Amino acid sequence: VVEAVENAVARVADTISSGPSNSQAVPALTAVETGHTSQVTPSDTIQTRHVRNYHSRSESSIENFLCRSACVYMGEYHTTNTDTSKLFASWTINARRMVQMRRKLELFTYVRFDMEVTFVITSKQDQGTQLGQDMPPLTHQIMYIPPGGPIPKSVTDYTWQTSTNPSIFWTEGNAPPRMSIPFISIGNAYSNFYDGWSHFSQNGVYGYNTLNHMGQIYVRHVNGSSPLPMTSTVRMYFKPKHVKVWVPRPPRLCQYKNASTVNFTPTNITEKRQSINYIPETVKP
């Protein structure tokens, strides 16, 4: 069986031919007080020729705009140390620490989508005086813990049994690991802004951290080895797909300060020029 699926191409409007006019129709006179934006084209104000326009608005749809991978977290962890908390990495899941993807997401109030997640892991040797040894390939474990699950205390804790938590095992020299996640929220859509509190007495925690609660990630080395110490760095990449967004907002002007708040320092509207009439001259012999 084969099924033919049709794809409607969507191009921009053609401009029509127009001639001289002398009448009572005033397309160029409006009133912005109504909250309405004028729908006037060049053919209403000047004389125009007919043009057949073949341009398409395909790369500005929301799906093509948001469906690319971006880094959201980077972290380090060791194979040998004297701290036992630096032997594994762990963090809470969100998209608020890297400013590019998070400014791109905050153009809208609410978003809903599935996700594709990729990891990029690299290792390196720690600076020691005596070098020289052959080491077998390293293996890494990534575990996702939804809220309420037990938390590892070390790299040999029983919790890495991962009986019900989903985990990834990977070894260096292969393709980067990848998996997809569905839309997981107790609400009908994700919320990027929340003008409210956590306690009914209008106090407690304000803003975004009240609503996310999506678990944690833990990463470790599996070998448990290496008399000479090594160091690994893990980077995580998000890619949304099957997207829907609501209620657009003005883009962020000020620089970000931290991952919890919308706090900012006052910034200008733009940079200056000489005077309200200044023109740069570019046609000179």
Ligand X SMILES: CCCCCCCCCCCCC/C=C/[C@H](O)[C@H](N)CO
Q: Where along the sequence are the contacts to a second copy (CB under 8 A)?
A: 1-2, 68-71, 98, 100-101, 104, 120, 122-125, 127, 131-139, 161-164, 169, 171-173, 176, 199-201, 222-225, 227-228, 282-285
Greatest C-alpha distance within the chain? 92
Q: Is 214 in the site for ligand X (CB under 6 A)?
A: yes
Site string for ligand X, 39-58 (x = CB under 6 A): --------------------
Question: What is the C-alpha separation between 236 and 205, in angstroms, rounded?
Answer: 28
Question: Which structure tokens are listed for 39?
Answer: 């729908």
Q: Does 29 bind other proteins (CB under 8 A)?
A: yes
Q: Report which residue type is found at 83.
A: D
Q: Which residues of 215-229 are buried (b: 16+ CB within 10 A; e: fewer)?
A: eebbbbbeeeebeee
Token look-up 């985990």 returns 167
Measured from the CB of residue 266, what is the shortest distance to other proteins in angstroms?
Answer: 7
CA nearest neighbour of 196 among 210, 184, 179:
210
For residue 89, state whether it binds ligand X (rule: CB under 6 A).
no
- Nearer CB in complex with other proteins: 80/141: 141
> Do 219 and 76 touch, CB atoms closer than 8 A?
no
CB nearer to other proteins: pick between 130 and 270 = 270
Minimum distance from residue 173 beta carbon to other proteins (Å): 26
Contact 231, 76 (CB under 8 A): yes
- Asked whether 59 and 30 are in contact (CB, 8 A), the reply is no
Phi then psi dihedrals of residue 104, to 5 deg: -65, -40
147 is a site residue for other proteins (CB under 8 A): yes
Contact between 222 and ligand X by CB under 6 A: the answer reads no
CB of 168 to other proteins, least distance (A): 16
Q: Does the protein bind other proteins through residue 4 (CB under 8 A)?
A: yes
Q: Are 189 and 211 in contact (CB under 8 A)?
A: no
Task: Tell me: does residue 265 bind other proteins (CB under 8 A).
Answer: no
Does 108 engage in binding with ligand X (CB under 6 A)? Answer: no
Closer Cβ to a second copy, 214 or 228, answer by number = 228
